[PDB]
Amino acid sequence: SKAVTRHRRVMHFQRQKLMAVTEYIPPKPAIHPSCLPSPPSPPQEEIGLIRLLRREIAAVFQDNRMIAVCQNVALSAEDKLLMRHQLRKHKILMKVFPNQVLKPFLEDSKYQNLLPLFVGHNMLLVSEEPKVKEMVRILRTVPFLPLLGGCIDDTILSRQGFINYSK
Amino acid sequence: RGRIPGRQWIGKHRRPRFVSLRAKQNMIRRLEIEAENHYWLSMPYMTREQERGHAAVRRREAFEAIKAAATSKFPPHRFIADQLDHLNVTKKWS
Amino acid sequence: AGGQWRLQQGLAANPSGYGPLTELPDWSYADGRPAPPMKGQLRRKAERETFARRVVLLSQEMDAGLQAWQLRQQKLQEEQRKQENALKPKGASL
Amino acid sequence: KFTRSRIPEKVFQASPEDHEKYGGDPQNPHKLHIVTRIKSTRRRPYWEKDIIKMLGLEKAHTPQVHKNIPSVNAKLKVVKHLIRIKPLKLPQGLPAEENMSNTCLKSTGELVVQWHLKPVEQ
RNA sequence: ACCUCGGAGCAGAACCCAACCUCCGAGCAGUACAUGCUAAGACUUCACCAGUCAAAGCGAACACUCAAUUGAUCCAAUAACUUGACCAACGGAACAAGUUACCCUAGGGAUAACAGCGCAAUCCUAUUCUAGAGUCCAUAUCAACAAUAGGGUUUACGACCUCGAUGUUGGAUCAGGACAUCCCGAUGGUGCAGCCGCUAUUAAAGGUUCGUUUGUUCAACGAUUAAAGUCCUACGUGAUCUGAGUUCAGACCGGAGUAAUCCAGGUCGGUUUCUAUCUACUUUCAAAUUCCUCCCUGUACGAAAGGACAAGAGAAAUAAGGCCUACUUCACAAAGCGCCUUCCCCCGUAAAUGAUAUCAUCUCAACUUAGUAUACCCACCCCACCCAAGAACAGGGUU
RNA sequence: UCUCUUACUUUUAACCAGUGAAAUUGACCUGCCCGUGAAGAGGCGGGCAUAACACAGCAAGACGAGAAGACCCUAUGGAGCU
RNA sequence: CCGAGCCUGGUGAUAGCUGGUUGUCCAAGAUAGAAUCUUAGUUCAACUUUAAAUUUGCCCACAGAACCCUCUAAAUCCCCUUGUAAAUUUAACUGUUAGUCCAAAGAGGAACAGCUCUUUGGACACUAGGAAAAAACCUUGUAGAGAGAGUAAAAAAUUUAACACCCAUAGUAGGCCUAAAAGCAGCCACCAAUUAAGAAAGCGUUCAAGCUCAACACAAAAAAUCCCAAACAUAUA
RNA sequence: GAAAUUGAAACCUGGCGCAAUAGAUAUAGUACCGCAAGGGAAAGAUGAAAAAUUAUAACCAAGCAUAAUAUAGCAAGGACUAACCCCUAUACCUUCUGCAUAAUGAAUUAACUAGAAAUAACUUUGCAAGGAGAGCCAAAGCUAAGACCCCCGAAACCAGACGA
Ligand code: FES
Ligand SMILES: [K+]
Ligand SMILES: [K+]
Ligand SMILES: [K+]
Ligand SMILES: [K+]
Ligand SMILES: [Mg+2]
Ligand SMILES: [Mg+2]
Ligand SMILES: [Mg+2]
Numbered sequence A: 001s002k003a004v005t006r007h008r009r010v011m012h013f014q015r016q017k018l019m020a021v022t023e024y025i026p027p028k029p030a031i032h033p034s035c036l037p038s039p040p041s042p043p044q045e046e047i048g049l050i051r052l053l054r055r056e057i058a059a060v061f062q063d064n065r066m067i068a069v070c071q072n073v074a075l076s077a078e079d080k081l082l083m084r085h086q087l088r089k090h091k092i093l094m095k096v097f098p099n100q101v102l103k104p105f106l107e108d109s110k111y112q113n114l115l116p117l118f119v120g121h122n123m124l125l126v127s128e129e130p131k132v133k134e135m136v137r138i139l140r141t142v143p144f145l146p147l148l149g150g151c152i153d154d155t156i157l158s159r160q161g162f163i164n165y166s167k
Numbered sequence B: 001r002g003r004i005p006g007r008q009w010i011g012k013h014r015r016p017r018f019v020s021l022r023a024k025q026n027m028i029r030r031l032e033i034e035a036e037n038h039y040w041l042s043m044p045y046m047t048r049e050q051e052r053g054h055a056a057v058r059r060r061e062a063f064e065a066i067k068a069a070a071t072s073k074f075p076p077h078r079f080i081a082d083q084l085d086h087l088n089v090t091k092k093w094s
Numbered sequence C: 001a002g003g004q005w006r007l008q009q010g011l012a013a014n015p016s017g018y019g020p021l022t023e024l025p026d027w028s029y030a031d032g033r034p035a036p037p038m039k040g041q042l043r044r045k046a047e048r049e050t051f052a053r054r055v056v057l058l059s060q061e062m063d064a065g066l067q068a069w070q071l072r073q074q075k076l077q078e079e080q081r082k083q084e085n086a087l088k089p090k091g092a093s094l
Numbered sequence D: 001k002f003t004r005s006r007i008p009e010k011v012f013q014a015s016p017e018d019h020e021k022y023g024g025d026p027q028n029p030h031k032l033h034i035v036t037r038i039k040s041t042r043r044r045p046y047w048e049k050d051i052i053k054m055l056g057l058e059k060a061h062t063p064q065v066h067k068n069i070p071s072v073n074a075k076l077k078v079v080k081h082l083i084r085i086k087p088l089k090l091p092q093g094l095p096a097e098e099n100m101s102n103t104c105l106k107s108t109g110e111l112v113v114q115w116h117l118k119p120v121e122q
Numbered sequence E: 001a002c003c004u005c006g007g008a009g010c011a012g013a014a015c016c017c018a019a020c021c022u023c024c025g026a027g028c029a030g031u032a033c034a035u036g037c038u039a040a041g042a043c044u045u046c047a048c049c050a051g052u053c054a055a056a057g058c059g060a061a062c063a064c065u066c067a068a069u070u071g072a073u074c075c076a077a078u079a080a081c082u083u084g085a086c087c088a089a090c091g092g093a094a095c096a097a098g099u100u101a102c103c104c105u106a107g108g109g110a111u112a113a114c115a116g117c118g119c120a121a122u123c124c125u126a127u128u129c130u131a132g133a134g135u136c137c138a139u140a141u142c143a144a145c146a147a148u149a150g151g152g153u154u155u156a157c158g159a160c161c162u163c164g165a166u167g168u169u170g171g172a173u174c175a176g177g178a179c180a181u182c183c184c185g186a187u188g189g190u191g192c193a194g195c196c197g198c199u200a201u202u203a204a205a206g207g208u209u210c211g212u213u214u215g216u217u218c219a220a221c222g223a224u225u226a227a228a229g230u231c232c233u234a235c236g237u238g239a240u241c242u243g244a245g246u247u248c249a250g251a252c253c254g255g256a257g258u259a260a261u262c263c264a265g266g267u268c269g270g271u272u273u274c275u276a277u278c279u280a281c282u283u284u285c286a287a288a289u290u291c292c293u294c295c296c297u298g299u300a301c302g303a304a305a306g307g308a309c310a311a312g313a314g315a316a317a318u319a320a321g322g323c324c325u326a327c328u329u330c331a332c333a334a335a336g337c338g339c340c341u342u343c344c345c346c347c348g349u350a351a352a353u354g355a356u357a358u359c360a361u362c363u364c365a366a367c368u369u370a371g372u373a374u375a376c377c378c379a380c381c382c383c384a385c386c387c388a389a390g391a392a393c394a395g396g397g398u399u
Numbered sequence F: 001u002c003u004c005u006u007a008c009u010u011u012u013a014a015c016c017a018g019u020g021a022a023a024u025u026g027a028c029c030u031g032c033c034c035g036u037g038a039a040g041a042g043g044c045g046g047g048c049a050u051a052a053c054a055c056a057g058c059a060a061g062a063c064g065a066g067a068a069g070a071c072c073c074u075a076u077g078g079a080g081c082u
Numbered sequence G: 001c002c003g004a005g006c007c008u009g010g011u012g013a014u015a016g017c018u019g020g021u022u023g024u025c026c027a028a029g030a031u032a033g034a035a036u037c038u039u040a041g042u043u044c045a046a047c048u049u050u051a052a053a054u055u056u057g058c059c060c061a062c063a064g065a066a067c068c069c070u071c072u073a074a075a076u077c078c079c080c081u082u083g084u085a086a087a088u089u090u091a092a093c094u095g096u097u098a099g100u101c102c103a104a105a106g107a108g109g110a111a112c113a114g115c116u117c118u119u120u121g122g123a124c125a126c127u128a129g130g131a132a133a134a135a136a137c138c139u140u141g142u143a144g145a146g147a148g149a150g151u152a153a154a155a156a157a158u159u160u161a162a163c164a165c166c167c168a169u170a171g172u173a174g175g176c177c178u179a180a181a182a183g184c185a186g187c188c189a190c191c192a193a194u195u196a197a198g199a200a201a202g203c204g205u206u207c208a209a210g211c212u213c214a215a216c217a218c219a220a221a222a223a224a225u226c227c228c229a230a231a232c233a234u235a236u237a
Numbered sequence H: 001g002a003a004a005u006u007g008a009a010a011c012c013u014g015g016c017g018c019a020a021u022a023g024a025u026a027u028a029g030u031a032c033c034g035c036a037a038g039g040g041a042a043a044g045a046u047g048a049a050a051a052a053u054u055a056u057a058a059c060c061a062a063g064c065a066u067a068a069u070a071u072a073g074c075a076a077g078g079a080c081u082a083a084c085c086c087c088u089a090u091a092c093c094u095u096c097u098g099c100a101u102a103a104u105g106a107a108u109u110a111a112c113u114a115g116a117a118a119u120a121a122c123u124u125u126g127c128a129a130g131g132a133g134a135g136c137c138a139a140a141g142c143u144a145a146g147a148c149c150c151c152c153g154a155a156a157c158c159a160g161a162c163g164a
C-alpha cells in the first residue's frame, strides 16, 4: 500500500516494538505531593469592598446609639419593603451586613458579646433616637418575626429588656 | 467467527500483532549492549596520521604469499615406482 | 540457566567453556600416569596460542608504527632549522 | 529507498558521565578490541555481510582481537549493531614467548598468562 | 490509436532505471566547397551492428550550424566515383487479404465469462454534529453540508485458484442459518382521548397465500390473510428432477459485408449419462401456534361520530402425533376427503427502601417487588408354524 | 395434470440356489465444529466426539466418475470457403 | 467418427506445444538488459562453471563531481590508509532470465485491492526455531553421533458520564419603528432607585402575563453450520 | 557441389549378434479383422528311457489362503516391560513466483522402454622444426586415443491403389 493511507496502516513488528519501548515515562515522586503537608497559602489581599464595610459598620455602632438585632426572615419583598417604609416613618433604618465581615469586627471590640447572635440571615434595626416603643408595635404585625436582642446606650439587652424599656 | 480477510500478516487488513512484556525487555537488552559499543569506539588509540603506514610491510608481504601460491600451480610429478606398483595385483604364492 | 550470574563472577556463561570441569583431563591411569591430552584440549591450546600471538603482534605493530610517526615529526622539525642558517641579511638590515 | 547509514560524529563522543559508568579512561584509551558477533548476518544488507568477513567474525560467539585505530573503527561503526565490543585488559601484561601456552581469555575481557586450573589458596 | 529517433518530469546529488504513464517534438533547412588526406589515445544508449570525440603529421588557409532530422545485407544502375526502399511493422521476409457457430489439432486458469476470493468507489446501516422542516418547538417525527464506524446482498475493480468432463437462469423438492423483525409477544415516547398509527428497545419459539400474461427472477393487478420480511448458504440444492429462456449443427425476418459469412435483435426446432467405494444421515422417546365470534361492553374513553383493554368461552384452520366406529377410495386390510389428542416462562422495563452526594435517587451501591418440569422407555423356550411384527435379521404369540 | 394423493396387480426389488460383468482405484487405520492455507480441508492449528461390526435406504461431500468436454486465448500449428 | 473415404508409400512427416527422460556420493551454483512477424521461443550480454595465466581486488581518509533549480532528501561515484583475499585477463561451453512477498522512495488506480509499474535492500525457490496452522515477518545458516550445557527470537492491553443551594420588589410597557410588539419582531443607547439585580443570557405569550440564570445573603454496536484452549487479580525474575 | 589429376587391396565356411515381450511378422502371412486394397497375432519347455508317469523334491512377484476386526487420524518415527495407547510428523512425480492442496499422472505385479556426432579447446603418450604408413598441417607443431549433443504424440500434405 501507499506510505500515507487514510486508515491507520499497521506498523512493522520491529517498528512497533521500537514505539512500545520508547514510550514516555512520567517521573514518579517518592512521596505523593498530596500526602505531604502543603505549604501555607499565599496571603490574600483584602477586597476594597470588605474594608469599605468595616468603615461603614464601625460608623453604625458609633453614630446611632440604639442597635436592634433581628433575624431577616424570608418575607416577601412587598411585605419586607412595606415594613421598611413603616420603619422609615419613625426614622428607623434596616441595615444588613454579612456575618463574615461583621463577626471579625465584633471579635475585637466593645460589642463582643453580640457575636453569638449573628448566626444566619440577620438584619440590624438602628436609629439615633431609641424609639423602642414605636418599633415593637411594627414588629407585632408579624408573629413569625423574632426579635433577637440589641444594645442600647452601650448596654446589651435582650428582647424583654426592650419591652421594659419601651414601657 | 474471527476471519481475517486474505492472508494473516500481509495485505490491507492484517492480523494485529502486539508486543509482549519480555519482547520489550529483549529489545532494551539489545540496546544496552550497543549503547556500550558506542562508548568504546569513541576512544581511538592513534589518529589517522599516526596510523598511516604502520602495516604496509605486513600487508605487502601477505599478498606476496598469495601470489606465490597462485603462481606455483602445476601438475604433480609422476614417479616411475607408482606405475610399476600396479603389477602387484597379480602377486601370488608359488 | 545461571549464565548471567556466572558472567558477574568472572566465569563463562556456559560452564562447558573453560574451568576445572572442562579443561582438566577427564581420566588418568590407575598407576597414576597422566593420560594423553584430549583432542578438544589440544584444539583449544592451539586456538588460544594463535589468539595470544595475534595479541602480541597487533600490540607490537601499533607501537612500531607510533614510533615511526614520532620520528618523522622530529625529522620535519629539524629541517626547518637547517634552511635558516644559510647566509646573513645585508643592505637596509645589515 | 533503503541505503547505508551515515552515523553522526556526535554519537561517538563519550560524555564525562560515561567514563564513570563503563570504567574507561579517555586519557589512556585501550590498545586492542575484543569484538564478538552476537547477531546473524542474515536479513542484513550485503555490505554488512562483507564487513563481517573482513573482520574475521564468521562464527558467532567467537571473540576476535582487533586494533583500536580509525580505519578498523570505521568498519566496526558499520556493523556495530551486530557485535559486542569490549576492551582487552592485560593485568599481567603482554604475553611473552614462555607464556604463549598458558594464555586464557576470560569473559571479563582480561587475558591471563598463567592458567593454572587451581583454586586460589587465599 | 500505436510500432523508429530526441528533450523535460518519475529517476531530487556518478551512470543506469518502466507504463495504459505525465508533456513537446524530429523524417529538415542553411552556410561551406581542404564539408581535404592521414593518425596516438578514448567514449559508446547496458550485447552485437551501428554511433561520437580526437592531439600530432602531410597539404592548405592566415573536424560547419543544429537535441532528434535517419535504413543494414543482398541486389539493380554506373567506365569510374557514386546513387537507390513513409523496407514508417522504421534490426528491414524480393513479392500473400478476409471468414469459419461445419470447423480440426496441439496447449493454456500465464487467460476471458459463471462461480469462489480480495477490495469497499458505488450500495447499505447506525451513531456524532443541530443548520433547516414539523402553526410555536433541533431531538413526536424528519433532515443539509459533513464526520465517525460497521456490513459484503447489487453495479464495478483485481486475475490468485479450476482449461486431462459442474453450461448458466428460473421453477419443483426439501430446506439449515443470520436478525438489520413483515406477523404473533413484552415495553418507552408520541403532535398517544379511544380505535387506528408513528417511532424506539427487547424477541428468531412459530408462521410468512393462491392465481392471469410473461422462460422468468422481479414486477404489474386479481382475490385474500395476523403477515404475504430483508438476506446468506457453490447468486443452497440439477450422481434428486425440470430444459422454458440463452448455448452446436437447420431456417426465416431485420441489419452489416463484393462475397464467404456475421448479429448484445426478433421468430421456429434442437440427445440432460452413472449400478453408491468412502464420509454424513436414515423416529430430536414426548411442552402449538393463529384468526374469528362471543362475554367484559356498547364498558373505559369521547361532545358526538366512534370504540378498546386483561380474564373466560366457543368455533375453525394449519402444524405435530395417531386411528378405522361411521363416511369415502375400498373390503380378513390399507388410505383420506374422515375421526381423535396437543401441557412452560421469557426478563425490554415499571416501581419501593436507601448511601456515596445525612434531601432526593429503582442499586454495573449493599437490597426489595413484578413473569425478573413432567411424560414415555425399562424382564431374559424357540425346531417349526402363525402374526395386526417384518427387506434380511430382529420382534410377538403357539394354552 | 393438479388441490392432495391413495389402493391394487405386474416387472423390478429384497432373500435362498446357479452363473457371473463394467466404468473406477496414489496409499488410507477414510469423523464434527471453528480457524488457517494455491483464496472451498476426512489428513494442518485449536476444541469436541469416538468398542468393533455387517445388511437395507438416502444422495450434502469426496471441487464424484465418464471423451486432454463445451466455453475464451495461444501457435510465424492445419483445413474448408469467399 | 466425410468442410473432403479408406489403405499403402513418402514417414522415424513436422510440432517454439504436452508428457517422460533409469546407479551412488561430494562440490560450485539465482532475478541488469538489447534485438526479434518477438514477448509459450531464440541469439547476444549479464550471471553462473571448470581449467589456466597474472596482479591487484574489496573495504575506503582528506580532496573532488552545475548551473536555470532551497521537495535545501536518504545516499552514491571517486577513493590513499586499513581490514582482508580475492580480482582481472586467457581457454572451453552449457544453463537461468512467463518471479514472488516484506521494508523504503515515487508513479497509475480510489490517499481500494493477495492491484499494476520502476528503484534500493532483505527474505524466499537452502536448513532450523519462533509468530496457532504459516514460501516472503523475527531468530539463525556449512552439514555427523550424544539419554550434556549456555542462549537467540519468543505469552497484548483496556471498563468510560451524580451534583449547586437559596433568592429577585424597583426610575418603566428606555425610546425608535410597529395593529400593539414591553428585557425577550427588529433596532439606537445601555445609564439607574435600593444592602444587592442584564435598559436582559435562555425559554412561554398575537403582544402582555409567567417564568430560570446572573445580584445581596447563606465515552456504541449487528450476518449468516456451533461460542471457542482450559483457566487463574496476592510466595520475592 | 564437381572435374582435370591421383590409384586397391581383396584368404567364404566368420560373430566383445540375438536366446521365446529378444532375434525375421512368422510355430504364420496361418488364426482372426475388413466388401476390398490392407492390417495382423498369440505360444513351446520332464527324463538316457513314458515300451520308467511308483512322474519333472524344498524355497521365490502381485493376488489369495493359512490367520476378519477394537477409540486416534499420509499409518511412520522417537520409543517402551508391552501390538496399540504418549509424543513428533501437511503422500509422490510433474508443471508454476508459490501445490497437503479439491492442478497433472500412477490399482498393482513382472518384463520392455528415452543422450547417437570429435571442428576447436582440454587431458595423457609418441616424435619434434618438423609430424604423419602418398594427399595434410606446421612462426612448437603434428600423430593417436580418451572425453559433449534423447524418447512418445498430432490435425495435415502428396503419389499409387482399393471401395456405390
Ligand atoms: S493517602 Fe495521603 S492524603 Fe490520602
Ligand atoms: K516486423
Ligand atoms: K468430473
Ligand atoms: K452424494
Ligand atoms: K513461441
Ligand atoms: Mg509501498
Ligand atoms: Mg485467509
Ligand atoms: Mg557498449
Ligand SMILES: [Mg+2]
Pocket (backbone or CB within 6 Å): none
Ligand atoms: Mg523491429
Ligand SMILES: [Mg+2]
Pocket (backbone or CB within 6 Å): none
Ligand atoms: Mg535501436
Ligand SMILES: [Mg+2]
Pocket (backbone or CB within 6 Å): none
Ligand atoms: Mg445458424
Ligand SMILES: [Mg+2]
Pocket (backbone or CB within 6 Å): none
Ligand atoms: Mg433486535
Ligand SMILES: [Mg+2]
Pocket (backbone or CB within 6 Å): none
Ligand atoms: Mg445455484
Ligand SMILES: [Mg+2]
Pocket (backbone or CB within 6 Å): E238
Ligand atoms: Mg439449478
Ligand SMILES: [Mg+2]
Pocket (backbone or CB within 6 Å): none
Ligand atoms: Mg449436486
Ligand SMILES: [Mg+2]
Pocket (backbone or CB within 6 Å): E243
Ligand atoms: Mg430450449
Ligand SMILES: [Mg+2]
Pocket (backbone or CB within 6 Å): none
Ligand atoms: Mg425456442
Ligand SMILES: [Mg+2]
Pocket (backbone or CB within 6 Å): none
Ligand atoms: Mg396425518
Ligand SMILES: [Mg+2]
Pocket (backbone or CB within 6 Å): none
Ligand atoms: Mg445370488
Ligand SMILES: [Mg+2]
Pocket (backbone or CB within 6 Å): none
Ligand atoms: Mg476391469
Ligand SMILES: [Mg+2]
Pocket (backbone or CB within 6 Å): none
Ligand atoms: Mg474408524
Ligand SMILES: [Mg+2]
Pocket (backbone or CB within 6 Å): F041
Ligand atoms: Mg475449512
Ligand SMILES: [Mg+2]
Pocket (backbone or CB within 6 Å): none
Ligand atoms: Mg483439524
Ligand SMILES: [Mg+2]
Pocket (backbone or CB within 6 Å): none
Ligand atoms: Mg451402506
